[PDB]
């Protein structure tokens, strides 16, 4: 879309309807006459547009009302209400822009933010934007969290998120204008290369790909048309459903074969019965011929009975000879029909062993998307976020994804090498307890009005706790933390001196010997100016490969690569970097997925702030003090960087609404 139209779409907003968000801040409007709603909607969309077309400058309210036009620019308050709602909730003046109005001399409120991942950094940026005093506590010696970029010399390569999934309605679109991000389109041509090293023939490539997609729809059919969602008291996973679909297609192939062979034997039987009728008739002809010859022998002149005998025995043989002619007519058609059925036999197999291996690579592909074995994905909800898809082609970052957090981080108070260990939250405020990661004897106490926790789901899942909560988080939050899944996916960065692959190929597959190792080094990316190939390890392979040395893993990489290009073409790598996100203690995983037994409802429980009980019993129920952001808290856009940016923007808005107050709901 385009216009004030397009600005709504490019802010994930319905252009013609008011959201549940806005119903809450503008209950007058949404309950008011329909004409006014249209008015509000336009001044929403136009401000949106004004921000979007130049997002390197702050969009002031009074710079806004100036570009606004009558009759819209008539209600000065509705404009001010709209602009402030947008500004609070991070739809405008978010990211990295030049402050027109400079920052307030004196601040209000104190927020401690745990983690400088993008979710924390975005919140922090916004809270400081709103006039609060913010400090981030970072366990690592760098910002970005799971946005991690390797840099040695001119070699650069993301160990963490590396793909922007489409600028159509993506907040990273805004960010890219705001920060120099060199975005490179992903060319969708990907050739598979079996374990022998020879490319899959284009014809087989296309056939198995369509079985994969056919197989996916089939599970969707088991899920939604057949309510095959719980099996023997346990929720069904996607992988389970794929087996039952593959099995039923294997069963159907046997049924076709049985039915076709059964038709042949039925036709054979018809024949066998026909042949017996013919053999008896032929033997019955036999004695009749003999009888006619004996009767014929009696030479004339003969009495009528003898003449009748000849005439009679002659009818009978002619008649039975007519009958044997009709039955070799009937054996003719049966003989040809049996040849037809023999030459028209249905497929012997549903999938060949080579065909099944290709299918794995598509499954490893999907285990890469959801950073987890398909046996863990919920069949019912693994594609619950299918609807919110961004438009445009996927892109990668040539300069490394780090440049974004590093950019967000300027002007912010980040304490690095600072590992939080307790979070204490009470009716009257909070204290966060952190240590030095270098020497853990050193100990720090941070006091504040609210804590924003962006701890990774894998960290929050750790047993025994890497971070104590005082008092303990309530059972509804811990149960969502268990139920939700935190997957794993790892990369191997391969650093050579000269390109030796198809450079117009961004990316090419390798097909696994076994199905158990389908994710093990199944895919390679070339998306950098320098000669760097990047190899994925997904599915079950990810967890296994972390117990296996760097060198042996580069070992198996080189093997793969030799088979596809020849032992003479592929040098030893200058630099090798293999990730281990599950072992990383500041992540303990790569991203989350919708586990079987979980749902998108869990992602929302994950984002509910915590409100401590009263200090003085009988005292009025207090303010919430513990807020959560990060990839696992945004239900509609999880496991991504854009969802993590949005989570931080959402919490900043929610925190400001409680500590600075909202003056836009009147």
């Amino acid at each position: 879309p385009s216009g004030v139209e397009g600005a709504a779409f490019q802010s994930r907003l319905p252009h013609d309807r008011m959201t549940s968000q806005e119903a809450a801040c503008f209950p007058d409007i949404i309950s008011g006459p329909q004409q006014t709603q249209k008015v509000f909607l336009f001044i929403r969309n136009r401000t949106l547009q004004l921000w979007l077309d130049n997002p390197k400058i702050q969009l002031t309210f009074e710079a806004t009302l100036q570009q606004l036009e009558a009759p819209y620019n008539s209600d000065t308050v509705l404009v001010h209400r709209v602009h402030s709602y947008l500004e609070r909730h991070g739809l405008i003046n978010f990211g990295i822009y030049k402050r027109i109005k400079p920052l307030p001399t004196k601040k209000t409120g104190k927020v401690i933010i745990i983690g400088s991942g993008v979710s924390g950094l975005a919140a922090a940026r916004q809270l400081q934007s709103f006039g609060m005093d913010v400090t981030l506590l970072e366990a690592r010696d760098r910002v970005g969290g799971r946005v991690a970029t390797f840099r040695k010399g001119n070699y650069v390569a993301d160990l963490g998120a590396m793909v922007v999934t489409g600028l159509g309605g993506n907040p990273m679109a805004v960010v890219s204008k705001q920060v120099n991000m060199e975005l490179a389109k992903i060319k969708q041509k990907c050739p598979l290369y079996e374990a022998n090293g020879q490319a899959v023939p284009k014809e087989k490539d296309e056939m198995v790909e369509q079985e994969f997609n056919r197989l996916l729809e089939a599970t969707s059919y088991l899920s939604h048309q057949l309510d095959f969602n719980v099996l023997n008291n346990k929720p069904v996973s996607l992988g389970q459903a794929l087996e039952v679909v593959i099995q039923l297609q294997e069963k159907h192939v046997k049924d076709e074969q049985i039915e076709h062979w059964k038709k042949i034997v039925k036709t054979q039987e018809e024949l066998k019965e026909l042949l017996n009728k013919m053999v008896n008739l032929k033997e019955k002809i036999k004695e009749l011929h003999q009888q006619y010859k004996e009767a014929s022998e009696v030479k004339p002149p003969r009495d009528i009975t003898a003449e009748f005998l000849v005439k009679s025995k002659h009818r009978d043989l002619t008649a039975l000879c007519k009958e044997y002619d009709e039955l070799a007519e009937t054996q003719g058609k049966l003989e040809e029909k049996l040849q037809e059925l023999e030459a028209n036999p249905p497929s012997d197999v549903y999938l060949s062993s080579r065909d099944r291996q290709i299918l794995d690579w598509h499954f490893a592909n999907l285990e890469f998307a959801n950073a987890t074995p398909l046996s863990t994905l919920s069949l019912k909800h693994w594609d619950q976020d299918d609807d919110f898809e961004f438009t445009g082609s996927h892109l990668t970052v040539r300069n490394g994804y780090s440049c974004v957090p590093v950019a967000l981080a300027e002007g912010l108070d980040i304490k690095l090498n600072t590992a939080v260990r307790q979070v204490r939250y009470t009716a009257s405020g909070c204290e966060v307890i952190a240590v030095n990661t270098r020497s853990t004897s050193q100990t720090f106490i941070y006091k504040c009005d609210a804590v924003l926790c962006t701890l990774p789901l894998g960290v929050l899942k750790q047993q025994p706790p890497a971070v104590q909560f005082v008092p303990p988080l309530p059972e509804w939050k811990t149960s969502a933390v268990q139920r939700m899944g935190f997957g794993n996916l790892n990369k191997v960065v391969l650093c050579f001196d000269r390109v030796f692959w198809d450079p117009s190929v961004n990316l090419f597959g390798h097909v696994g010997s076994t199905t158990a190792s389908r994710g093990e080094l199944f895919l390679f990316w070339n998306l950098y100016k320098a000669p760097i190939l990047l190899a994925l390890v997904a599915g079950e392979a990810a967890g296994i490969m972390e117990n296996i040395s760097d060198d042996v893993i580069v070992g198996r990489c080189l093997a793969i690569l030799k088979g596809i290009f020849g032992s003479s073409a592929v040098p030893q790598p200058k630099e090798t970097v293999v990730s281990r996100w599950r072992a990383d203690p500041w992540a303990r995983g790569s991203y989350s997925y919708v586990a079987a037994g979980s749902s998108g409802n869990d992602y929302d429980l994950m984002a509910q702030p915590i409100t401590p009980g009263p200090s003085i019993p009988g005292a009025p129920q207090p303010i919430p003090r513990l807020f959560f952001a990060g990839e696992h808290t945004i239900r509609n856009y999880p496991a991504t960087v854009h969802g993590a940016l949005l989570s931080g923007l959402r919490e900043a808005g929610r925190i400001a609404d409680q500590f600075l107050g909202a003056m836009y709901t009147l």
């Binding site: 793909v163 992903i186 969708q188 990907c190 592909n365 999907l366 890469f368 998307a369 959801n370 594609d383 976020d385 299918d386 996927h394 496991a639």
Partner: peptide, 4 residues
Amino acid sequence: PRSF
């Protein structure tokens, strides 16, 4: 979520 899935890719290409």
